[PDB]
Write a protein that binds this ligand. Structure first.
Ligand SMILES: COC(=O)Nc1ccc2c(c1)NC(=O)CC/C=C/C[C@H](N1CC[C@H](c3cccc(Cl)c3)OC1=O)c1nc-2c[nH]1
Lengths: 238, 7
């Protein structure tokens, strides 16, 4: 996260840190708890991931230093990537992780509500991007979960900012015209959380951008409301 | 939480 501040413990209890174990253990991506055995994240996070056996999901974490060999985690039973996904820049950048065991909800780990189909017309004015990503283009993963308040940008304005790309309605953009606050390397897969009528909604999945926090380059997020039926298809099967 | 995800 560029231009953000340290989160307080329990502030974003749906936020997870997804780690890879191969060749050595390191943070891979962010993700969001959406159900008691379900993490919603970005499909591009799994580039080169040949098996869910190398993945570890840690919830209720503020600081990466809380993670040691004796730290409890959730194993991943299945990686479900949208089957229209080709690359982040072309959309469908969405994936589900089916966990091997269930998350016991509490004040440190609980789900974020998905947006409602009726909320496609609502204007969100209180949106935040979170993660342990870089604070600048060439940096390192942060110990403390960072947060940054970012305004949503219309599809029309986002398309003007990304000449040469096709910004679809399955994408949602967020950023200041002058830049300065955005997601960066290591934040992808994490949430864009918007508070509406005192309830937090998972509006976006951190996906891609041209650099980080540049003037007139908003962050591009998977527009979660456009995938509610896909999520229910995969999580409510049989 | 209008949208419901079954356990
Ligand atoms: C000690 O452990 C580490 O050092 N771990 C680590 C360090 C960096 C990264 C990763 C892990 N994870 C991957 O490589 C997984 C594959 C993901 C690829 C794209 C991803 N990304 C690209 C830009 C994008 C972005 C920018 C601006 C606005 C938006 Cl809305 C999105 O954010 C992002 O995280 C990114 N993550 C990393 C590099 N790049």
């Amino acid at each position: 996260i560029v231009g953000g501040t340290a989160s307080v413990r329990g502030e974003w209890p749906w936020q997870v840190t997804l780690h890879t174990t191969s060749p050595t253990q390191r943070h891979l991506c962010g993700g969001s708890i959406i159900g008691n055995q379900w993490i919603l994240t970005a499909a591009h996070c799994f580039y080169g991931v040949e098996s869910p056996k190398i993945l570890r999901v840690y919830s209720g974490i503020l600081n990466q230093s809380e993670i040691k060999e004796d730290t409890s985690f959730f194993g991943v039973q299945e990686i479900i990537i949208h089957d229209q996904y080709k690359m982040a820049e072309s959309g469908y950048d969405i994936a589900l992780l089916k966990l091997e065991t269930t998350v016991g909800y509490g004040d440190s780990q609980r789900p974020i509500c998905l947006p409602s189909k009726g909320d496609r017309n609502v204007i969100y004015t209180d949106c935040w991007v979170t993660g342990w990503g870089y604070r600048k283009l060439r940096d390192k993963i942060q110990n403390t979960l960072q947060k940054a308040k970012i305004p949503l940008v219309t599809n029309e304005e986002c398309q003007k900012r990304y000449r040469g790309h096709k910004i679809t309605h399955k994408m949602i953009c967020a950023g200041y015209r002058e830049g300065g606050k955005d997601a960066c390397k290591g934040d992808s897969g994490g949430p864009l959380s918007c508070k509406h009528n005192e309830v937090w909604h998972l509006v976006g999945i951190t996906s891609w951008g041209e650099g980080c926090a540049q003037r007139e380059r908003p962050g591009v997020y998977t527009n979660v409301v456009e995938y509610v039926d896909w999520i229910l298809e995969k999580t409510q099967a049989v | 939480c209008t949208t419901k995800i079954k356990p």
